[PDB]
Amino acid sequence: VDYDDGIDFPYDDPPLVCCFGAVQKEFVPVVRVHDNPMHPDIYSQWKMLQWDPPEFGRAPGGPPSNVAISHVRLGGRAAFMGKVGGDDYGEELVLMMNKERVQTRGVKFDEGASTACTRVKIKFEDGKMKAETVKEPPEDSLLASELNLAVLKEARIFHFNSEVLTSPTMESTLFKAIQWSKKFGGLIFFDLNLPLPLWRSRNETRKLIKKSWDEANIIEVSQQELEFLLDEEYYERRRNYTPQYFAEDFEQTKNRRDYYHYTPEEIKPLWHDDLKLLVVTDGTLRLHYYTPKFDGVVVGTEDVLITPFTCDRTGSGDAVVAGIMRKLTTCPEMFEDQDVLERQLRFAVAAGIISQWTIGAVRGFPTESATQNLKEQVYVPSMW
Amino acid sequence: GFELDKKLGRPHPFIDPTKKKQIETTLTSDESWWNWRKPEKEQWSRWQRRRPDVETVFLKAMAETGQVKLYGKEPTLTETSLYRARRHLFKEERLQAERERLAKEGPMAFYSEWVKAWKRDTSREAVQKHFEETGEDENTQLIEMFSHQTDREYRIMMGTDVRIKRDPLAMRMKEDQIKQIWGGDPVYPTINYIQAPDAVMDFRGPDFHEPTPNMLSYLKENCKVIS
Amino acid sequence: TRTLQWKCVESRRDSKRLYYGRFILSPLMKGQADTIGIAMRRALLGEIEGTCITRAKFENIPHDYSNIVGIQESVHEILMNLNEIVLKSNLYGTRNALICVQGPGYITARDIILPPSVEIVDNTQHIATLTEPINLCIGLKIERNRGYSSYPIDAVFMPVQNANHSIHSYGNGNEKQEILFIEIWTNGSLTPKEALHEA
Amino acid sequence: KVAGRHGNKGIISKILPRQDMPYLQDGRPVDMVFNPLGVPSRMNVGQIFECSLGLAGSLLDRHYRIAPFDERYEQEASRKLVFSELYEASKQTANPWVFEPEYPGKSRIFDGRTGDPFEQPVIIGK
Amino acid sequence: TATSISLGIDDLLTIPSKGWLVQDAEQQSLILEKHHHYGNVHAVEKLRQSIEIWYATSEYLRQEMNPNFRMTDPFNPVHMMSFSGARGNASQVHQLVGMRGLMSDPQGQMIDLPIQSNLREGLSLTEYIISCYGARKGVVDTAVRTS
Amino acid sequence: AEHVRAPYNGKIKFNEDLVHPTRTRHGHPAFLCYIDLSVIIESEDIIHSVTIPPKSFLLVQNDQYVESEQVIAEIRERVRKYI
Amino acid sequence: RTNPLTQIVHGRKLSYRDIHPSHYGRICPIDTSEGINVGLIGSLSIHARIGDWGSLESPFYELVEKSKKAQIRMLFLSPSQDEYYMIAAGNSLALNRGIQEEQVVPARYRQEFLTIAWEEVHLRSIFPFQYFSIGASLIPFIEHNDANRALMSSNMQRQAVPLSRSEKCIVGTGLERQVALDSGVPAIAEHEGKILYTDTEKIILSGNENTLSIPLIMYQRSNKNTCMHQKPQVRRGKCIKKGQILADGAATVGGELALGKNVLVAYMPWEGYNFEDAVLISECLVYGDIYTSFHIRKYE
Amino acid sequence: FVREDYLVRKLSAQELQDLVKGERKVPLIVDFYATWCGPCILMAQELEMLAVEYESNAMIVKVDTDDEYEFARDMQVRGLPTLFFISPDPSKDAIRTEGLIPLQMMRDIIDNDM
Amino acid sequence: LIGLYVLTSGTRRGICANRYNPCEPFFCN
Amino acid sequence: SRNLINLFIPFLHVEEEFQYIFIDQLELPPRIYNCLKKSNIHTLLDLLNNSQEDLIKMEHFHIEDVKKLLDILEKK
Fold first, then answer.
1. Which of A264, A368, B138, F57 could cross-link with A75 by S-S, CB 3.0 to 4.6 Å?
2. Which residues are CB-neighbours of G172 under 8 A, at least 6 positions away?
C-alpha cells in the first residue's frame, strides 16, 4: 500500500512460505452427500469408508495450518498468518505449531475471544430451523492492520483456502495480504478446498471465488471441484457412456477406471493471464497439471488396504499441496520444463500416499526422507 | 602414476584407463531372439535400489577425508566387498592419528572437545603460563576442566576409553550420514507402532468389537429364558 | 600439593533415594587404573553393607494374604511397602522398631518409631492408606548385613545401585599415564563419596 | 525353564552374583546370558530384532505394537525400524554404545570377574 | 568366553551379487510369462523355466556363500560357527543369508512360487505360508523316521 | 546338469554355423553343440576364451552382450498338467 | 486355566496331517500338536467363521467394477468358492511407464500360485492376522523366524506361569489387547457410570440411578494350581463406558496379556554354563523377585 | 436386561426442531457428523464420554449430514465435525464450535456458558 | 570347538595385515 | 598386598585448608527474529541457554539487538 516493513536480510534457505487462514485441529471442510452410510452408532465400521471413500473424500484437504505443518516436515520453512483467542485452546493450537517448527510471529492473539467458538442465533423461518452469525470466531477475524509484513516480505509463496471467503472480515483482510505479497514478489497459491456452503450452486460459487481466482498464480483443485465449477452433469454423463455394439479401441474393452484428462479448451473459462500452474488432483491417483505452454498428467497410486486398521485419508490433500510447494520453491524450472515438473510432482504423490497410512492429519504427515524413499520404491529408476 | 600405485597398494583403478577399451557394438534387438531383447519399458523390480549398509557409509566418509579414493562418487559393490576385508586397517590408522594428536596437543586441548563449558585457552603454552602465574600444574587444571563436564558429555567421551577404542570416524559422524546405514526414514511411520508404556487399553476404541453381553442377560433379553 | 589427586567432578541428587557422583583420579601409571577400577567396582557392588527391615509382626492377622478392614491395601501389599523402605545405620545387631497409629490417613516412613542408632532416608515413602479410624500396631525388626536375605521381609541390604568406571590416556608417553573416572549410584543411605571411601 | 516368544527355550543352569556378570558400557550388569550358537541352527532371527528394539524402547520410554510382515511396506522394514529406533535411543539418552555405526545392535561389554573387555562386540537387548 | 562370539543383523551377510542375480531371474520370468500369454510357449515350458531358473539361482548363491566369507569376512560370527564345525551347516546358513528356494507340496510336487527372500530380509506373507509346508512335513518325516 | 556362467562382461563371439539350432525345454531358441566350440568374450581389459564341450546347449547369440555371472551355456514319473 | 492365553485358545481347537490350500485363512498352518496327533488337532484362524452348512468361512476384500452399488466390499468365502476367485496378497506400490492396472502380483487361483496383472484380481487378503492362530499371532517379527520355531513358540506361551508382579512387553504384535478382552480374566463394566469406591475386594460403580457392586477375585486357585488375582485399574470419581476395563487379572497389565518380563540379556558363550539351551542368570532376578510366582495347591 | 452400548441419540431435523422449540431445562449439545469423515470417529468417542459425565445435566444428540444435508447448511455448518451448544435460556444465543476440541473445553462451555 | 578355532586362528596375512605393499617381538621361550 | 593397599590409600587422602514460550510470541523486530531462527533457536529455554557472548558470535547480531531482547525479557 505505502512502503515496506522490517530490515532487509539475506533470507535463509529454503525459501519461506506463508499460510493464511484459520488454524484448526482436523476439521474437514469439503462436505457433500454420500450414498453409502455405515451404522450410525458403531464407529468401528466407519473405517470401511476410509478404504472405499466417496470420490470427494479420496484425498481430503483441511485448514491452512495443516499445509504449514506438512511443509515443514517435508524440509521447508513456513509461517502461519492468522488469529486465535487468548484462551487455553488458543495456546494449544499455537503450541502445536511451535512444536512442528512453524513460525508463529504472524499469529495474533485476541484476548477477548474464545478460540473456535462462533456465537449464532437460531431462527425458525418458514417452518425450518436456520442459524445466523452474531459474532465471528477469532479465527475469522484477522484485520489488515494486524498483518505481519515482515512475513509477507520474506515469504515466496502465499497460500490460502476458500474458507476465508465465507467470512466478511477475512475476505477484506485477504486481499490486503495478497497486495502486499505481490508487491514483494511472492507467488499466490489458491488451494480451493470448497467448504459445505460453496457446494450449493455453481453460479453463486463462481461469482464468490472469481476475484480470488484471478489473483492466484498457482491453483490446486480436486477433480470434483473442477467438474462442479464447469459442468457437473456433462462429465457424469461422459463417465457413464458405454458403446452399444463394440468398443472404439482395445483399451475401452477392459472397463477400467476413468482417468479423463481435461483438455486446455475445457479449462479455458477458468484460465487467466497471471496463472502459472493449475493442478487437478484425482486423489493421489492422478495429478493433472496445466501451464500456459503445456499440459499433462502424472500417474500415481494409493494403498490404504496395506494397513486397514490405521488408514485415514484426512490430511492427505494437504500433504500433496505441501509437497508441491516444497518442490516449487527449490526447483523453479518446474514452471517451464515439463519433464522436470513431472518428476517433482511424483514427490508430491508419494507424500500423499504416506499421509493416508496414519490416523490423524498432523500425526501422520511424512518427513522428506520417508517421502523420497517411497518415491524411489514405487517408481522405476528412470522416472525419479 | 599407474603401475607404481598398483605396486605399492595405493588407491588406483583396478583396470588401467590407458589399457581400457570399449566393447564395440552388440546386437540391437533386431538381430536378437525374443528372449534376449531388452524390454521397451523399464520393469519395476523391488530390487531396483541398492541395499544400504555400513560399508557404503564409511567408505564415503573416508573418501571425503581423503583416506581412500574411489572410482566414482558412490562406492561400488566391488569396493564395499574390498572394504569389508581391509576395514580394520583403516580404523587402526584413524586410531593412531588420534593417539599422535593427543601426544601433540596435550590432554587439556584434546579432551576439551567434550567439555563445552570450558572457555579458557587449552594450548600447551597457555597451560604452562597458567601454571607459572598460579601454581596449578597441568593435572590440577585438567581436574578443574572435567569439573565442568556434563554427564551427557562424559558418556560421549567414553569412546576415547583405552579399552573401548571407538572408531574416531564413527564418533564424529553426523545424523544425516548415520541414517543412511539403514537407508533413511521408514515409509510406514513408526508413530503407528508407538504406545505409551503406562497406557490403559480402551476397549471401546475403533479396533475393538462390540462389548460381549452376559449370556444369561442376553437370553432373557431375547425372551428365551424366564425368570 | 599432592602429585596424585582425586576429586568429585559431579555430584547430583536425582531424588531422595537416587544419588549420583562422579570422581576422577589422576595421574596413574599404566595398569594401575585397571587394577583400581575392577577392585573398586567389586567392592562397591558386593562389599558395602546396608540396613533395612527384616521382618514384621501383625497383631490380628491370620496370614499375610488376608485383608484388614479399614486399610485400602492388603497385608501382602504392606510387606512389599515395608521392603522398599530405605534406612541408614552404622551399627550392627538386630534392632526393633514400631508402627503404632490410629486412622484414617496416610501411613508413611516418617511414622516409624526408630531406635536411636537407625535413621530413615525418605520420609514420603508410602506404607499404607487408612480409610477408617482403626488401630494398627506392627512390630519391626531391623538388621545391618551384606548381600540379601511374624512375617519375614526379603531384605536386599546393598545400597549401591550401580557403578561404572572409565580409563583414559593422560597424553604423550612420558610414562604413559592414565586418568580414572568412577561413577557411583546410591539409594541415599550413603552418599556416593561415602560409598567410595567405604569401599 | 524360561523361553522367549521365538521358540528360544532354555533351562537355568547357574545363578551368579551381579558382580560376576558381564556388564555394559553404562556399568549395568546383564540379567541373563544366552548361547548365541542356538540361533543359526534354529533359524529364529526374530529374537535378534526383538531384543534390540526392546532396549531402544526401554531407554526411550516407548512400547511397540507391530503387526507381522512389515516387509510388505518396503524391503528390510524391520531392520529400518530397529536401527532407526536404536539410533534415536542412543542420541536422546547420550548412550553411544546403544547404536554403534561400526556394528549396529552390538557393543563391547566387560567381564565382571576381571574388568577386561570381551574381544568381539556382543548383541545386547531387553 | 574371552572372544565372545555373538550374532547381529549385520553379521547375517548376503553375497554382493544377490540383487543382480535375482533381478536377472525376475526379468527372464517376466518375458517368458508375457510370451506364454501370447501363445509362443506352452504351460509346461513356463512351469519348467520357473522351477529351474530359481533353483539354479539359489544353488549358485549357496556355492558363492563360503568364498565370500573366506575372502571378505573370515571372522564373521555366522561363518565361524558353521565353518569350524561347531554348530550349523551351509544349508541352514543359506536359509539365513541366501534364499529359501523352492518348497514341495505334500503330494510330491513343487510349488510354482520361489521363495526369493531369506530369514534376515523377512519372508512375505505368501512366502511364509509356502514355507509352512516344509515345516509341517519336516516333523512328520522325523516322527516317521524314528519309529 | 551344469551351467556355464560368463566370467566377465563383454561381447560373445562364435561361429553359429558350427552349431545346430534347437528349442530348449523352457521354450527358448538355442544352439546344440556337438563339438569343442571355442567361444570368445571380449571384455574391457583382455579377450577371454571359454571351451564349450560337446552335447551342450549354447544359450547366447554371436555378438550378444553378456554380463558377468550370467548363464551362457548348459553342459549336458508321468505327470499330468491341466490348463 | 494356566494363564489367560490357555483359556481363550482351548475353545478354538479343531479335532479330526498335511496342510491343504483350502485351509488358508480358516485353519492355521502352524499351530498343531507335537507327537503322534500332529496334523489332527489344529486351530481356527483369527478371522475364521462357521457358515450355514458347517463350512469354515474367511473374509476377503472384493475388487468390484465401476458399475455396482457394492455397499460392503468385505465378503466371507466358503472353501468351495475360494478356488474360483483370483486372490492376491500383494500391494499396489509399483509404477512404471505403463499403468498401474498392468503391474503384476502373486495370487492364488485354483489351488496354485500365479503372477497376474492387478486388473485380473478378484479379491484381496488385507487383514494382518488372517492366516494364523492366536498363538502364532503373538510372535513379533514372526516373518524372520523359521516356521518350525513358530509352532514351538505357540506351545511355550501356553506353559507360561502368571507372575506375582506383571509387566507389559516392550515389543508386541498388538494382539495382546484382544486376548485380554476375550479371556474374561479382567473385570469389564457391564454398565456405564462413575466409580465411587474401590478396595482389594470390590469396586462400586453407579450410573443412571443404578448402583453395582463388582467383587474381585483374590488368591484363587486355577485348574493347574496357578494363582488368579484381580487388582483395580480405576479410582474413585472416574467415568466408565460400558465394556471398559475395571480391574486387571493375573498376567494382564492395563488390558494387555502380560506373560513375562523385560530383562537385560547378552548373547555370548559363558564358560559352558549356557552350553546348548542352558541359561546363565544373575542373582538380581532372584532377590529382585522378577520371576516369583504364586502357586496354590488344594488338598482334599 | 442388557444395557445399551451407546448413549448419544441420532435425531432427524424434524425431531431436532421440536426439541429446540419445546421447553428445555438442561443444555442441548448437537453433533453434526458423517460416517465417512475420519475425524468423526474420534469425536464420536468423546461425546459418548461426555454423555456419561453429564447423565441428566445435559442432553447430547447427533445429526447425520448424509441424511440432513440441507438442514446442516441452513444451520451454518461449514465442515465436520461441528458442535452446537444450545442454552435452556431462550434469550442466550447458541455456540457453534469447529474441529476436534478437547473434552475439557466442552465441559467449560457447558458449565460456564450453558 | 569355537574356542579352539578362535584360539588357533593365527595372524592376519598379506593385504589383510598391511595397507601397503612392504616393497615383531622375539621371545626367548 | 602392600602394592594393592598403596593403590587405595589415595582415596582416603584429605587436603589442607519457559519451554512453552517461543520466540514467535514475543513482539521482536524482524531482524532479531530472523537471526534467532538462523541458529535453530525456537523456544525461550533455548534463548536463555545461550550466553551473551554466544549470541554475539552469530552473523548479523549487534550490541543494540542484545539490549532490546533483554528489555523485552524484563517486561514478561
1. A368
2. D63, D64, D65, D66, G138, G140, G256
